[PDB]
Chains A and B, each alone.
Chain A
Amino acid sequence: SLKKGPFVDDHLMKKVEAQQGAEKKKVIKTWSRRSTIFPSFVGFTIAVYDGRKHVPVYIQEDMVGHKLGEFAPTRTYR
């Protein structure tokens, strides 16, 4: 619903491109609640904040569509 291009915050892009040369550092802490996923992210490992703790999760291929917030659910039911 943003047909003028997708969106990811700059204080994550610059911090994800900065590894494009060498290997990737296992940690990218973030807020992780406003960013969709771009093709330049495959193979990384981004930890995801849920308002309480950051959740470390890698990046696969098909896991490229949605936003970052769909992996650290802030519900915790059971």
Chain B
Amino acid sequence: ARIAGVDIPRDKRVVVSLTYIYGIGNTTAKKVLANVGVSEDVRVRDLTNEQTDAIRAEIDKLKVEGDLRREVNLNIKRLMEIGSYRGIRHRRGLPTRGQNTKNNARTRKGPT
């Protein structure tokens, strides 16, 4: 449910649909399919029960899960609870370089 962790759609193209799962970008899908040896197939996906297992195996060699968030969450957790200016402004959203915030809220909170 559906095929890898969760979140696979039906009646789409394969390589695009494999990006959908949380943590798989675009290079991941192409390299995974490379290690099986497949292609689009086609615009409504019609995979075989064996190909499904092949991809289910090759995917389980990746830290990408429905659990990648836990690592990121704990990382920003270690951040926000030691110093931490980065963690402090991570209680209020500022980056690895800062941008002189007198517009830099229109993407984080909708300031107006």
Contact = CB atoms under 8 A, between A and B. Distances in A.
Find out whether A and B make contact in their complex, taking CB atoms under 8 A apart as touching: yes
Interface of A: 60, 62-63, 66, 70-71, 73
Nearest to B84: A70
Contacts of B86: 66, 70
A2 to B, nearest CB: 16
Interface residues of B, number: 7
A12 B86 CA distance: 24
Interface of B: 78, 82-86, 88
A63 B84 CA distance: 9
Contacts of B84: 70-71
A70 B88 CA distance: 10
Contact of B85 (A60, A63, A71): A71
Contacts of A62: 78, 82
Nearest to A63: B82
A71 B86 CA distance: 10
A1 to B, nearest CB: 12
A60 B83 CA distance: 10
A11 B26 CA distance: 49
A70 B85 CA distance: 6
Contacts of B82: 60, 62-63
Contacts of B78: 62
Contacts of B83: 63, 66, 70-71
Q: Which are the 4 A-B pairs with shortest beta-carbon distances?
A: A63-B82, A71-B83, A70-B85, A73-B85
